[PDB]
């Protein structure tokens, strides 16, 4: 039927976000201890790295989202929910997937933070070419501009402070990461349980044959089509797995902020759960990709 619970509730809906920031802060700060700045400028100065990946999600992924719209003949609400997901920048949770993939972790940031600063300038003007007949009003104001900067900077701080630890005393990296492995696993329990308390109950309605089909094949095409254009275009073979996991993976916590404001919530219904469900299959597709390229070593 409906989505009974109301969102933005202090008891549980805030615990999904006020704890996720704590979850992301330490994780990426811990992730920040595997990058050397002295070769970061090498990635930036010669743009052969990000160019294939940045184009792979600002000139290719919107096509994948838009093609699935017209081909599947989805209504102009879900045909726009998956298009907004397509234009979304490189996911802050994608940088995790480069670590397990043995990819070039230094090039992950150069296409995560640099491809999010383009979301400010592309997406507002990337919708006029893709919402010409899917939405009547303008999307200029609906985009959460102040919700990206407070998201990029919250990501940028562990990006730099994560390596700065190697400047004063890295002896205290032992004193930090030895507990980070111990401690951050407690947060994931709080993150996963509370989600099943508030939004997980009404998930059963959200599934739809023409909605799971897009949410299942779109993270997959983003993965594969991001890789072939990466490795085959003369880029390093071992570095290609960094681009592949960045093209397919992209944030969807930014799409939900648009649907809340773009148009009324009774039209949405439990379509609020698509970005939550999209990441589940986005995560699920990768966790099948992790093993396969961990098989090639063995």
């Amino acid at each position, epitope marked *: 039927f*409906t989505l009974p619970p109301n969102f933005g509730k202090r008891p549980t809906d805030l615990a999904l976000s006020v704890i996720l920031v704590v979850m992301l802060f330490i994780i990426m700060l811990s992730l920040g201890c595997t990058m050397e700045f002295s070769k970061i400028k090498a990635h930036l100065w010669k743009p052969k790295g990000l160019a294939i990946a940045l184009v792979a999600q600002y000139g290719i992924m919107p096509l994948t989202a838009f093609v699935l719209g017209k081909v599947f003949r989805l*209504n102009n609400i879900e045909a726009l929910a998956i298009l907004i997901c397509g234009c979304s920048p490189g996911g802050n949770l994608s940088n995790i997937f480069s670590l397990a993939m043995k990819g070039d972790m230094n090039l992950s940031i150069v296409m995560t933070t640099c491809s999010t600063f383009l979301a400010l300038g592309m997406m507002p003007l990337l919708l006029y070419i893709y919402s010409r007949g899917i939405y009547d009003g303008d999307l200029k104001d609906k985009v959460p501009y102040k919700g990206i900067v407070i998201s990029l900077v919250l990501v940028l701080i562990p990006c730099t402070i994560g390596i700065v630890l190697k400047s004063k005393r890295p002896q205290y990296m032992r004193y930090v990461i030895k507990g980070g492995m111990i401690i951050i696993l407690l947060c994931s329990v709080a993150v996963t349980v509370l989600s099943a308390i508030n939004v997980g109950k009404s998930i059963m309605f959200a599934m739809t044959p023409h909605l799971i089909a897009t949410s299942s094949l779109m993270p997959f095409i983003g993965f594969l089509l991001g890789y072939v254009l990466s490795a085959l275009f003369c880029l390093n073979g071992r570095c290609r797995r960094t681009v592949s996991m960045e093209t397919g993976c992209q944030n969807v916590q930014l799409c939900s902020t648009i649907l809340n404001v773009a148009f*009324p919530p009774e039209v949405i219904g439990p379509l609020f759960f698509f970005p939550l469900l999209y990441m589940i299959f986005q995560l699920g597709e990768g966790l099948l990709l992790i093993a396969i390229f961990w098989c090639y070593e063995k």
Partner: nanobody
Amino acid sequence: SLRLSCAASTNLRSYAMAWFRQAPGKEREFVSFINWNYGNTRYADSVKGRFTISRDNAKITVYLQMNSLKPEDTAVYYCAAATIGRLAGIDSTTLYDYWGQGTQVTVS
């Protein structure tokens, strides 16, 4: 108690369909709403308990079952459909891109 159907005359994909009512010599007032993919519904103030709007999975018809009709409900009901998404109030008629032929309900 009479139930009235609204069938789309062409194969079109609408994300929500609602019913409106134009009182004799009066502005059209909101009556009922239903989501299309899902079952979200939002009846008007007076009609909260009385009427009931329901779709069918198989066909594309929309129904509005009425019960306990009041003699103030005599008006001309105007089925409405919403094709393209936009920011507009449910109660407001600006959200709906397609309208209906129109039918008149009279009671005593």
